[PDB]
Write a protein that binds this ligand. Structure first.
Ligand code: HEM
Ligand code: HEM
Ligand code: GLC
Ligand code: GLC
Lengths: 717, 717
């Protein structure tokens, strides 16, 4: 290699390529954010004139620009594409991707080959952003532009939520191992796609427009479509709807040779003002645009919603052919339909053309059955597409509470994981006290109590904001029978006891107050923690925010929740099979998902260990002599040089810690030892392990607990 | 390559290795710091019982530990070494390194080859840290241990300052281009060392103990010593003193084969608890320790200060020889002095032994002259050593105001860049107003006025805290004749006018109030900025903290200040010759040195441009129609897509920006264009470029100006 300046990207990952990267816990730091801590986007966007906004976007769409002139004089379709690529990175495995951070404007995504030209697309909207300033995020604007495009070309959309917060440095996501753009080192078996990924190649949104690995076989392309879309939460109906609806607008761009297209934005030179893919071919823009290399124009009404796409697809026979840049497309057999497809810049007509993936929709059995139906019933398409699209651009916004502004529809949807609205008066300070008492009297140990509250709350992920302790989904499928949550243990026992306390309280009922199961689960941990803190000479009181409600099993899509099952929870010292990296990297990814900082992550492991939140209540990492008592013993003992650590002879990624007389005194996993071993983590352990550290540990621990308990609580935030 | 998970170090620098790393401007982020914003180290350390602490460290030094047992039963010398390696990374070129952040405890430094065994040393102190908690930083403790070591073996040290604040993630410093440990790709010419580096090889503190490139030639080794020490601010006397004083204590370690030493801390396995270099040789510790591979014991009194080192060096003749691990050392000719040097663990005696670098001190003309003197005059050594050591561990603490606790000596020293204490009453709210008025009336333009303030204040560097607008050093050598500051321009003119206003006010004098020249320079910019703000419809008032005093040329080591001359200041659109990377990376480095965040960097470039802070008052980047008026025009115009950018035909790393009619309307440097071209910077530009942005720009700009005006003001902080 060759070490570089830090200003030029060099650092410690250059010496030890595989070390833990603690930087994933301080993504998008306050200092980096020019808005200042005062700033509350929700507050700003809810003052926004939506009509004025729509009018301003419409004006942009219909005002062509020298530096990237507009197909058919209307940018709408490009804006639709844009919005789709914005939302289309989302994947269900980890909730990462999606249009929620406006990440498309930063690396790597701003320079993905599949996002060619979208740089131009984004730039075009600056005039709108200029006008709205802080009241409108890029995150919100990019997908809204796509939604206004649909409107302005006569398709009525189902609604729209504002509220995506802009970020100031790019979100670090794992996009695959491939070191080259468009590479494919991500399949095995018949055609099994590497988790978590939901594209077929590096730098693609979903599938190859020319079919798997460039091979234009529609039956084969469908398998990839089906699979990648499933992993972006779209089933068969939604998928079909999405592509047909999509390609009812605009056209592709492959006017001349692929190799006359310069380098992508991050590699572009300075005078290009952050715009890449400059074309030496022709004018290089407009008439001559090379984006994807393909040259299809799907409908004869590229800037209007109607049924041509499905009509064209079924109303001809198709034969293989090559774009002016040598790309596989389809075109109509025996020169049928010649001249009926209009030119983007008033040239002559053109023949009916289609992507290999478009034919999938007629050639695959399931896609056909669906799309033939909509050929004779377009108002069914217009309905399904309205729905899919809405879901597509809202998938990663989590709880419906977050959706903002005039256009949010009245109706809730299953994939929003909804929860009943608060229907009664909420418990006050007195009933809270009262209940806490009752919960300790219930004979549920601190261990069960905390184990449970954690199990509930920690199901959350910051990525798409799904999961959490709201909804009380811990008692429904599939959460109630997750390995890590342990059904074999006593979770059912704990649930039952808690429901009983709920009912009791709910008869007693002072006035019109009721308590939900969801609140009670969380309250339980809070009570337990209060107890465990006393049992080690502290009178701390753990804060609690009531308001959670209880979902029915009907409001809970079992299949959808599959993806939140922890395969690894270092906080509960759980590690089941098939994680990509060893235990400790899993811990970090998990902390990153819970929106925790390294300090927060540290104290939680500390506290959780000694409260015996541990899975199967194993002794690993429980470096205390005391039972169910909240102390920093974890930290003090971790730092004890009188203990000597070796891997267990019974080889199984666990370890023994012996003292001066050779007795095994402590055992522990990798997740436990990495805190005393990694120099950054050990630095933190030394803070909480000092002699003066006790009250501060208890404080910081509670502050963190309470943070995790509140992660999904957008309803009050 | 092979892309990794972010949790495992992968990111965007993998796709474009050489892109700008804006992460250097958010080093050590608040969220990562387990202390919380309330925490005030100054206030904690100042409550520490220093005697108790000395006692507690003494007790550690003399209590040997199984896992790394103590040479001669006293750890002192190891602590000395440690403290030396802690301070020893510092280099004058950029002020980076030094013991001030306690960086030795993190990567890369914790695993430098030269830092072998120091992991053990640090760990040995945990018992102390444990006892003092937040009242004592690892930064302060590591060097203090060294100083207490010196005291406890009977050498009286000159004083000690507390106040180094611990940091939570490692400072990203450029250590050289070498991809292998101990490599050397850093020389050229006769023996010219690559700036900024001050070591001969990668992972060395100063020089090779076996002489240049392992070649044990003393006259040659001395050239390296002279050179590297110079670049760590030591001259000839100081250097000699340091090594002799140093080696009056302890021994080296090379008991058996070099290749039986395991991997260094960062690459060590988990059960080692962050300790590297485990030895399979013998017990691997103590009697058998392998650290550097060499096996020298310099004096016969390894744990006592006296004159043996110099006596032994001069009182024998030396012949080449090899350590048990095949390292070049010297030993006494014709078996003289056999058995007289004692064993670390009560073995038999040993012969007089020396490093090749030790002989340098006798063999080099200049070192010989100096050391022969101290052979007959040990009290002069004891005096010089006391002084160099103090300077060594205090070099990077900047202003003497920061030094803390009972042990700071009374006397000031030239290398501390001192400034007169405040000898009068300071100007209050009215005199400030009054003078601001007088400065505008002076007919100094906003441009000169700001250019100057900036030139003064921006000489600061956060690295070793040297530089700044305190001391009014702008008018003395060498600052007054710095290319970038422009002597050919009217700096003299501005100085003179200012001195005049100083004098006038000083006669007028309401009671016992005086104003310094330093305060006046700063005040000047603040008035100018207040003026330029009005001239664009804003009544903002710029805050100002009086208290700066004026240094004499006697208090100002000209040669020392040489290193602070900007070879590049993107804020003044200045770029002179011989910087390692292009204009824009220099900008970032400079911002990092000024402790600025990207938002801060951004608004400053914006404001400075339009106030015509530009060097040689060049038009580059001045994207405004208005003169000396504070607006966001820079930002608005940078985001104007109506302008087209190309490199000047007159090829010189500048650019032309033309409009719709082909006329050059704007010109600019790389430093200017990168703000519209790098996606993260462009994101910030877009905040300050919006239509609603005007007041917020002015606010944030002032806030940043005021921050830079105050960088060196530890006297009031
Ligand atoms: C099977 C999955 C899909 C594939 C393989 C695919 C592929 C493509 C390609 C290659 C282009 C040409 C880009 C260019 O050269 O300008 C394109 C354009 C376009 N795509 Fe799709 N796409 C897919 C799904 C979608 C979806 C789900 C939508 C929206 C719901 C959509 C909307 C559009 C639009 C509106 C354009 C035209 C943009 C313009 O006029 O510049 N596509 N698509
Ligand atoms: C000319 C530059 C220097 C070189 C090349 C050098 C080299 C070395 C080496 C190779 C060791 C043996 C490492 C080991 O096996 O423990 C050592 C030890 C030591 N050095 Fe130096 N040194 C230099 C300057 C200094 C300075 C300036 C000081 C302090 C002011 C110092 C203080 C010590 C002490 C106290 C030890 C003994 C450590 C122990 O007993 O465990 N050295 N040095
Ligand atoms: O009466 C309504 C209350 O009791 C119900 O049975 C629900 O479980 C609870 O969430 C609600 O607050
Ligand atoms: O009066 C003599 C000196 O005192 C003043 O207060 C100023 O601080 C200084 O620059 C001046 O030369």
């Amino acid at each position: 290699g060759h070490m570089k300046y830090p200003v030029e990207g060099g650092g410690n990952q250059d010496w030890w390529p595989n070390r833990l990267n603690l930087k994933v816990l301080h993504q998008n730091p306050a200092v980096a954010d020019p808005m200042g801590a005062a700033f509350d986007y929700a507050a700003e966007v809810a003052t926004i004139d939506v009509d004025a906004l729509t009018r301003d976007i419409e004006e942009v769409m219909t005002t062509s620009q020298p530096w990237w002139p507009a197909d058919y004089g209307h940018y709408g379709p490009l804006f639709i594409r844009m919005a789709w690529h914005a939302a289309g990175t989302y994947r269900i495995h980890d909730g990462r991707g999606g249009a929620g951070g406006g990440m498309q404007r930063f690396a790597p995504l701003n320079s993905w080959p599949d996002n060619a030209s979208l740089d131009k697309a984004r730039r075009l909207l600056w005039p709108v952003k200029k006008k709205y300033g802080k009241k409108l995020s890029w995150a919100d604007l990019i997908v809204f532009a796509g939604n206004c495009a649909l409107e302005s070309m006569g398709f009525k959309t189902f609604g729209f939520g504002f509220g995506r917060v802009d970020q100031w440095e790019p979100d670090e996501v794992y996009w695959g191992k491939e070191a080259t753009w468009l590479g494919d080192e991500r399949y095995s078996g018949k055609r099994d796609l590497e988790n978590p990924l939901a594209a077929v190649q590096m730098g693609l949104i979903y599938v190859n427009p020319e079919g798997p690995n460039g091979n234009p076989d529609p039956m084969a392309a469908a398998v990839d479509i089906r699979e990648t879309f499933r992993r972006m939460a779209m089933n068969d109906v939604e998928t079909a709807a999405l592509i047909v609806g999509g390609h009812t607008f605009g056209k592709t761009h492959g006017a001349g040779p692929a190799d006359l297209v310069g380098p992508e934005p991050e590699a572009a030179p300075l005078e290009q003002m952050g715009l890449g893919w400059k074309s030496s071919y022709g004018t290089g823009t407009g008439k001559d645009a090379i984006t994807s290399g393909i040259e299809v124009v799907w409908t004869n009404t590229p800037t209007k919603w109607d049924n041509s796409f499905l009509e064209i697809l079924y109303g001809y026979e198709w034969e293989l052919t090559k774009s002016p840049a040598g790309a596989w497309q389809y075109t109509a057999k025996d020169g049928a339909g010649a001249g009926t497809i209009p030119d983007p810049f008033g040239g002559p007509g053109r023949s009916p053309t289609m992507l290999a993936t478009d034919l999938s929709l007629r050639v695959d059995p399931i896609y056909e059955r669906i799309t033939r139906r909509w050929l004779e019933h377009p108002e069914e398409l217009a309905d399904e597409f309205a729905k899919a699209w809405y879901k597509l651009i809202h998938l990663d916004m989590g709880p419906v509470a977050r959706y903002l502004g005039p256009l949010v529809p009245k109706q809730t949807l299953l994939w929003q994981d909804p929860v009943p609205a608060v229907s009664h008066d909420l418990v006050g300070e007195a009933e809270i006290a009262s209940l806490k008492s009752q919960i300790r009297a219930s004979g549920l140990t601190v261990s069960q109590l905390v184990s449970t509250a954690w199990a509930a709350a920690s199901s959350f992920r910051g990525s798409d904001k799904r999961g959490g302790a709201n909804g009380g989904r811990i008692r429904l499928q599939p959460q109630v029978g997750w390995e890590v949550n342990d059904p074999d243990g006593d979770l059912r026992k704990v649930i039952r006891t808690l429901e009983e306390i709920q009912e009791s309280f709910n008869s007693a009922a002072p006035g019109n107050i009721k308590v939900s199961f969801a609140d009670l689960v969380v309250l339980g941990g809070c009570a337990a923690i209060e107890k465990a803190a006393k049992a080690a000479g502290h009178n701390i009181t753990v804060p609690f925010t009531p308001g959670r409600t209880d979902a029915s099993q009907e409001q809970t899509d079992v299949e959808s929740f599959a993806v939140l099952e922890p395969k690894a929870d270092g906080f509960r010292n759980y590690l089941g099979k098939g994680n990509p990296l060893p235990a400790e990297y899993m811990l970090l990814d998990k902390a990153n998902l819970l929106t925790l900082s390294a300090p927060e992550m540290t104290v939680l492991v500390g506290g959780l260990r000694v409260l015996g939140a541990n899975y199967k209540r194993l002794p690993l990492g429980v470096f205390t002599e005391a039972s169910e008592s909240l102390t920093n013993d974890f930290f003090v003992n971790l730092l004890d040089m009188g203990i000597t650590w070796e891997p267990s002879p019974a080889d199984d990624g666990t370890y023994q810690g012996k003292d001066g007389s050779g007795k095994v005194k402590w055992t522990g996993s990798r997740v436990d030892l990495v805190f005393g071993s990694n120099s950054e983590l050990r630095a933190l352990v030394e803070v909480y392990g000092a002699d003066d550290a006790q009250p501060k540990f208890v404080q910081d621990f509670v502050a963190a607990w309470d943070k995790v308990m509140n992660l999904d609580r957008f309803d009050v935030r």
